[PDB]
């Protein structure tokens, strides 16, 4: 089955977009390159995770 | 919903962070310069995919109006149904409940491969009735609302 990775990716990408709205979430620990996380980073991070959610949406629609 | 408040100014700043040169358009190179600074290593194919989802016309770059359109989007139940379908792909019996071990497995080992600490926060947010299966219809609703 080939909708398995698209479905997983869609779940994972929605949750990461929903968890980024919590400033104390564990989802901020993945950015190991960045020493200290200022608010001008979290802006770009939320924008990126939103874009990643919309193509997780598009890839899943093309497989469901 | 509601009429956009000062979040227009919050999005204008956020738009300005990608728009390094100030020409009013976000390019693939401008998006890649931001992502690599965060430690990510995306392919030019991935950049084009992200840019194409938010570009409403065809000019291949994002302006601020399309940026606002994108940042102002939980499409009623229409986007709940899709997450509900994605969960159903792993609901082997078709009952509406998935095992904690199974959910932990798919989230850690395939797709976008989330960390163990993220999956812990994930299973924790759905207060398990003891050591029982997790209902994902409650997950979809907690996420969207
Ligand atoms: Ca530009
Ligand atoms: Ca455009």
Swiss-Prot record, chain A:
Consequence of changing residue 56 to V: In LQT1; uncertain significance
Reported effect, residue 29 to N: In LQT1; no change in potassium channel activity compared to WT
Effect of residue 11 to D: Reduced protein expression, probably due to misfolding and proteasomal degradation. No detectable electrophysiological activity. Reduced electrophysiological activity in the presence of KCNE1
Domain of life: Eukaryota
Annotated consequence of substituting residue 9 to P: In LQT1; decreased potassium channel activity; decreased CALM binding in the presence or not of calcium
Function: Pore-forming subunit of the voltage-gated potassium (Kv) channel involved in the regulation of cardiomyocyte excitability and important in normal development and functions of myocardium, inner ear, stomach and colon. Associates with KCNE beta subunits that modulates current kinetics. Induces a voltage-dependent current by rapidly activating and slowly deactivating potassium-selective outward current. Also promotes a delayed voltage activated potassium current showing outward rectification characteristic.
The protein's name in its UniProt record: Potassium voltage-gated channel subfamily KQT member 1
Source organism of the structure: Homo sapiens (Human)
Lineage start: Eukaryota, Metazoa, Chordata, Craniata, Vertebrata
UniProtKB/Swiss-Prot annotation, chain B:
Keywords noted in UniProt: Acetylation, Calcium, Cell projection, Cilium, Cytoplasm, Cytoskeleton, Disease variant, Flagellum, Host-virus interaction, Isopeptide bond, Long QT syndrome, Metal-binding, Methylation, Phosphoprotein, Repeat, Ubl conjugation
Residues reported to bind Ca(2+) 4: 127, 129, 131, 133, 138
Mechanisms controlling activity: (Microbial infection) Inactivated by S.flexneri OspC1 and OspC3 proteins, which specifically bind the apo-form of calmodulin, thereby preventing calcium-binding and activity.
Compartment annotation: Cytoplasm, Cytoskeleton, Spindle; Cytoplasm, Cytoskeleton, Spindle pole; Cytoplasm, Cytoskeleton, Microtubule organizing center, Centrosome; Cell projection, Cilium, Flagellum
Residues at which Ca(2+) 2 binds: 55, 57, 59, 61, 66
Residue numbers carrying N6,N6,N6-trimethyllysine: 113
InterPro entries reported in the protein's UniProt record: CALM/Myosin/TropC-like, EF-hand-dom_pair, EF_Hand_1_Ca_BS, EF_hand_dom
Cross-link (Glycyl lysine isopeptide (Lys-Gly) (interchain with G-Cter in ubiquitin)): 20
Cross-link (Glycyl lysine isopeptide (Lys-Gly) (interchain with G-Cter in SUMO2)): 20
Residue list for modification Phosphotyrosine: 97, 136
Further facts: This protein has four functional calcium-binding sites.
Protein name (database record): Calmodulin-1
Gene from which this protein is expressed: CALM1
């Amino acid at each position: 089955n080939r909708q398995i990775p698209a479905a997983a990716s869609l779940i994972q990408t929605a949750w990461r977009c929903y968890a980024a709205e919590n400033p104390d979430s564990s989802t901020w620990k993945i950015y190991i390159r960045i020493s200290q996380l200022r608010e001008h980073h979290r802006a770009t991070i939320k924008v990126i995770r939103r874009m990643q959610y919309f193509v997780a949406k598009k890839k899943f629609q093309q497989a469901r | 919903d509601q009429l956009t408040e000062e979040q227009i100014a919050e999005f204008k700043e956020a738009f300005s962070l990608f728009d390094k040169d100030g020409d009013g358009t976000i390019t693939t190179k401008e998006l890649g310069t931001v992502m690599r600074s965060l430690g990510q290593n995306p392919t030019e194919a991935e950049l084009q995919d992200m840019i194409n989802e938010v570009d409403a016309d065809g000019n291949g770059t994002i302006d601020f109006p399309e940026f606002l359109t994108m940042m102002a989007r939980m499409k009623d139940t229409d986007s709940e149904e899709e997450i509900r379908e994605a969960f159903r792909v792993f609901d082997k019996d078709g009952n509406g409940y998935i095992s904690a071990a199974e959910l932990r497995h798919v989230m850690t080992n395939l797709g976008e491969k989330l960390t163990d600490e993220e999956v812990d926060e994930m299973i924790r947010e759905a207060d398990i009735d003891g050591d029982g299966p997790v209902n994902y219809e409650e997950f979809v609703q907690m996420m969207t609302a």
